[PDB]
Design a protein around this ligand. Structure first.
Ligand SMILES: *[C@@H]1O[C@H](CO[C@H]2O[C@@H](C)[C@@H](O)[C@@H](O)[C@@H]2O)[C@@H](O[C@@H]2O[C@H](CO)[C@@H](O)[C@H](O)[C@H]2NC(C)=O)[C@H](O)[C@H]1NC(C)=O
Ligand SMILES: *[C@@H]1O[C@H](CO[C@H]2O[C@@H](C)[C@@H](O)[C@@H](O)[C@@H]2O)[C@@H](O[C@@H]2O[C@H](CO)[C@@H](O)[C@H](O)[C@H]2NC(C)=O)[C@H](O)[C@H]1NC(C)=O
Ligand SMILES: *[C@@H]1O[C@H](CO)[C@@H](O)[C@H](O)[C@H]1NC(C)=O
Ligand SMILES: *[C@@H]1O[C@H](CO)[C@@H](O)[C@H](O)[C@H]1NC(C)=O
Ligand SMILES: [Zn+2]
Ligand SMILES: [Zn+2]
Ligand SMILES: [Zn+2]
Ligand SMILES: [Zn+2]
Ligand SMILES: [Zn+2]
Ligand SMILES: [Zn+2]
Ligand SMILES: [Zn+2]
Ligand SMILES: [Zn+2]
Ligand SMILES: [Zn+2]
Ligand SMILES: [Zn+2]
Lengths: 126, 126
């Protein structure tokens, strides 16, 4: 499986630290939680709640490597609700947070984004 | 394409800096150049020459993210030659170096390694 770029015209980028409030980082964390909502069957939408760590790598575009917390909101899935206007669950029985790692590839000049990696963990209540 | 680990039993690891002379890093850089030799058709084998940057991430094993330089050796390909005993080209017309980025996944308890990403650049002689 030699599907590699082994004679690249550009020197490949290495991941570098980036501020966790960088507008690009913030948008990448939104993509991540949207990938999560798309890929699960909760009755509520989740929303990014905290970005603890972030790296960005140049690869024909921007690849974000993110450590992001996501939380259940009070907005139901499948009602065409926008996450910017969703607040987190207050009800303790409905409060749920996950710790995720994601990689998000964004090519703004081609209007393209992808979330090729998303790993999430809900910690046991014991 | 929801082929993700979204209900993981473990909190996912984030990539952390690791020393570029760490024995695991050194072995990962060897895997990278071996992936390079496997995936190209030079008449000589290449060998890792310098590891400039390294991150390691815990993901059911160790994933290395490496910035590694590779160089052409005087050992011919397809002669069953071991890289530890190969020295770099002296002949200026045969000297060739590439800057690579690689990701190498190693699971030592399962005797498994993989090089899922390798990107390499030969800088123009102008
Ligand atoms: C967004 O999700 C759909 C997958 O449909 C999914 O429903 C989720 C809630 C979850 O349970 C998931 O496991 C389930 O498959 C994706 O479309 C699906 O993709 C797979 C593989 O490509 C196809 O085999 C399915 O037929 C297809 N189903 C439908 C209804 O479209 C979609 O790819 C995904 N998008 C992204 C970008 O993640
Ligand atoms: C190691 O390389 C071989 C690929 O054979 C290659 O020869 C190289 C020098 C290079 O020119 C490359 O582009 C060429 O394909 C891999 O086996 C091949 O894999 C592909 C896809 O899996 C198959 O379609 C080929 O039929 C198959 N060919 C042979 C002769 O086996 C092999 O996967 C690769 N190994 C690794 C781990 O990178
Ligand atoms: C919280 O949610 C549960 C289940 O939907 C419900 O039984 C309970 O009444 C709710 N409590 C409050 C105060 O909203
Ligand atoms: C270097 O290699 C080239 C091509 O193989 C050859 O023409 C030349 O004689 C070599 N020079 C020396 C000093 O080895
Ligand atoms: Zn809609
Ligand atoms: Zn609000
Ligand atoms: Zn919980
Ligand atoms: Zn697109
Ligand atoms: Zn936990
Ligand atoms: Zn052999
Ligand atoms: Zn020697
Ligand atoms: Zn050169
Ligand atoms: Zn294996
Ligand atoms: Zn260059």
């Amino acid at each position: 499986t030699c599907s590699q770029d082994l004679n690249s015209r550009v020197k490949p980028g290495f991941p570098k630290t980036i501020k966790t409030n960088d507008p690009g980082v913030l948008q990448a964390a939104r993509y991540s939680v949207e990938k999560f909502n798309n890929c699960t069957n909760d009755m509520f939408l989740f929303k990014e709640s905290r970005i603890t760590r972030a790296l960005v790598q140049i690869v024909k575009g921007l690849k974000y490597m993110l450590e992001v917390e996501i939380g259940r909101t009070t907005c139901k899935k499948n009602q065409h609700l926008r996450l910017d206007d969703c607040d987190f669950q207050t009800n303790h029985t409905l409060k749920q947070t996950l710790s995720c790692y994601s990689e998000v590839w964004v090519v703004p000049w081609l209007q393209h984004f992808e979330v090729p990696v998303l790993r999430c963990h809900h910690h046991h209540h014991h």
